[PDB]
Structure formats: C-alpha cells, structure tokens
Amino acid sequence: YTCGANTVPYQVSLNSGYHFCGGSLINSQWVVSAAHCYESGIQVRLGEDNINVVEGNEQFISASKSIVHPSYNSNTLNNDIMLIKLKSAASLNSRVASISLPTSCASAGTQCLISGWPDVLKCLKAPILSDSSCKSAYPGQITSNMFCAGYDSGGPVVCSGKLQGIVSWGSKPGVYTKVCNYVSWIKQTIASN
Ligand SMILES: [Ca+2]
C-alpha cells in the first residue's frame, strides 16, 4: 500500500542516475543497504516520496565511501549487507530521521514494516516466519544470516522500532538479511570510518 509521504523517514533512495536500491539511515552520516546493491557513483536521497518529482523535503548527498561486508557472497547472498557513508551529514528533521539498530534479534510472528519503491513509497506489514517455514520454502539456500517474512531491494524491514532486516532476495516469502547478526560489525565499521 501507499505509505504516505515521509511516513518512513529513515527510508532512503540510492540513485546513480535512477533509483537502483533502497537503504536505511542509521545516523546522520551512515546508511545501511544490501551488498548486492553495490555500484559506483551513489547519491543518497533522503526525505523522498515521489522519486520523480522534487516535492520540497529532499536532501541529496553524495556517498563518500561504500563498505561491502567482508564475507559477502554474491552467489548465495550470504552476508548481504553494506554500509554507505554520506559526504556531508544529513540535516535531521521529522521527515529525515534515523532508525535504531537492534540490540537483540526479533522472534517469529513479530510484525514488521517493509518499505520501498507507482513512484511513491510503498509499504507492507508482514510477520517474521518460522525458521522451518523459511527454510522449507527455499531448501538448501537459507543461512543463519537470513530470515523470511510474509504470508527494489536494500530497503528496511523494521520491527518494534529496530532495523531487523534488509530486503535481500526471494521469488514464496521474501528473504531478508538478519541485521541483528551484524550489529557489532556495523558499529565498529562506522566508528572506524
Ligand atoms: Ca522527490
């Protein structure tokens, strides 16, 4: 469904000439996205609703650095996470806001908000599926760094106010990078860059 303009203020659009992936603002200088979204010349677009019209609340900021997870495997999408640094800090406001990293993993059954990009932001509320339901849908392919939820990519999966997933792959529920496994890496990496 249509989220409503700026109702997901941590949602970002990654643009290299066009919207190629979503991401999540985790502080004024850093965005989390999927490693499979990696490409050169990224501009981070904050405060977006319609990605084809300047509506008045946008901030466009060039990325200064991208860091793909050291263990990212593009064949399997294991460890599908990357960090993007903003060249200048975003000006935080009601429509441009960070989302908190988790301190613990979410449980099966927890409802989450998945969002991403006709040209306005779309939303889906869906529960995290059991481990078994997830792995049964994709035998051989699910690792401990993935979860499924259900009944673009790189965008957020937010549960109880925490960024628990990144839109990674699918076909059959969606498969999401399990952010709670990466919090130490995220925190150390951003602090060191
Ligand atoms: Ca816009």
* Residue 50 token pair: 């319609």
CATH dotted code for 1-8+99-180: 2.40.10.10
Length, in residues, of the chain = 193
Cα–Cα distance measured from residue 150 to residue 38, given in angstroms and rounded to the nearest whole number: 26
Q: How far is CA 130 from CA 101, 149, 177, in A?
A: 22, 9, 15
Asked if residue 58 belongs to a known ligand binding site, the reply is yes
Q: Which CATH number applies to 9-98+181-192: 1.10.150.20, 2.40.10.10, 3.10.20.600, 1.10.3720.10? A: 2.40.10.10
Q: Which residues contact 188 (CB under 8 A, 6 or more apart)?
A: none
Q: Hey, which residues are catalytic here?
A: 36, 80, 153
Asked if residue 153 belongs to a known ligand binding site, the reply is yes
Q: Are strands 111-116 and 122-127 parallel, antiparallel or unpaired?
A: antiparallel
90-107 in b/e form (b: 16+ CB < 10 A) is beeeebbbbbebbeebbe
Q: Which residues contact 154 (CB under 8 A, 6 or more apart)?
A: 14, 21, 22, 23, 33, 34, 36, 37, 166, 167
Q: Where in the chain is the domain with CATH 2.40.10.10?
A: 1-8+99-180, 9-98+181-192
CA dihedral sign, ordered 170, 130, 32, 73:
negative
* Residue 8 token pair: 């997901």
How many whole angstroms from 52 Cα to the centroid of ligand 1?
Answer: 6
Query: Determination method here?
Result: X-ray
Resolution (A): 1.0
Closest among 69, 2, 22 to 163, alpha carbons compared:
22
Are 115 and 123 in contact by the 8 Å Cβ rule? The answer is yes
